[PDB]
Amino acid sequence: SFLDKLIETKNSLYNVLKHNFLYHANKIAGSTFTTEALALLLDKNVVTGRHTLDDVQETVNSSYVFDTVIDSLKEKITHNFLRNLHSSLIFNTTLHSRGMAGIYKTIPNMILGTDVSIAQPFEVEPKLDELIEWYYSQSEVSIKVIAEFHYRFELIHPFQDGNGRIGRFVMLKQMLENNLPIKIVSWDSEDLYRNSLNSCSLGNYVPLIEYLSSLEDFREVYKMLWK
Amino acid sequence: LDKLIETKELSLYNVLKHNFLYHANKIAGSTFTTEALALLLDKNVVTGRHTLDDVQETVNSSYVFDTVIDSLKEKITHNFLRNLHSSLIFNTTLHSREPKLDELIEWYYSQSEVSIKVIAEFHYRFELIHPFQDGNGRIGRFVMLKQMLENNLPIKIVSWDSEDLYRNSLNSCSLGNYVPLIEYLSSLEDFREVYKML
């Protein structure tokens, strides 16, 4: 019943979820928008503070991507769905040219803070199919399923940039679609999210599961808004 | 002008771009200070309080300025003006939504000698025609600048301080009478002498 109410306000439960999610997801990606500045941008289309053009444009894009994710609930994660999310997210940035929007990487990339083996470009499309086919094979989608999906997706790292944000968008989508607790990956001075990721390995996602469990359920925190 | 042309990738060019865009954009309602505009142009960093439209239109004006310099000595056409307009209003809230112009352009290129009088008459007539819904003023000032540059004429930047002299000169003008505008432009300082040191 949470989802219906969320939809019927599309100040509102929707704007709270959007503001919180976008704030943390973008800040993890390096955005310098404060909570007040992001609120002002989302509500009144006014930019304040010091930002790169890319930060401004990508924050604005992230708003549209969030809307798309909510509008496309229950729809299948496909290659084109993911490429369109990426395309919306990096629209009108210094990555739009070169036409890396919205396209899988052609040149090897990396996640720094680690030397873990990222998927080579040629492996992106097949592994992703194997991942998607795996995801929809699950009888019941759980936080554990979503955590494994998240880690594997990030290890694939299909796009040259924006992998973190797109991954967390998809994670939010999966949670919403399966009436699971809404766990919003939050920024913090200690990099608990990143460290939980780095404690993980293929076949071992317990650090991420524990991290997600350590997060509060958004649905309960703002129960006053819907219940 | 040659100095202008080759300090392009590099500076007379950046000084002209910065000053011109500052005044042209401010007249159009931009809230970028001269420092904020400089920071945007040089480091692609946005500071201060601005609407999204202001940010985007300022960035666009940078691109349009570059295009205008690229098209020096090239003939003013309709598609050229439409390209300026499209570039200027790209990614704004203004995005969703002929004969008199042809006549004006041909009239302009028929003159054996281009003068400030010719440019002034062109400017007023362009504003009276008003070919675009928005950005008409900025496009007009871009074109005026182009016309001055192409003919080694004094480079006079319509200034934000100059209002409302510019506006009142425009309101005193009529078809066939452009003397208020000519006197106004004449009252403006020549960019070339101020930055002759460059």
Ligand SMILES: Nc1ncnc2c1ncn2[C@@H]1O[C@H](COP(=O)(O)OP(=O)(O)OP(=O)(O)O)[C@@H](O)[C@H]1O
């Ligand atoms: N040790 C790790 N193991 C697996 N994945 C990781 C690890 N560390 C980070 N990641 C994921 O890789 C993504 C890379 O993005 P990062 O945070 O490094 O900066 P960014 O490139 O600016 O963010 P974005 O990808 O949204 O553009 C992270 O968001 C994270 O989800």
Ligand SMILES: [Mg+2]
């Ligand atoms: Mg990035």
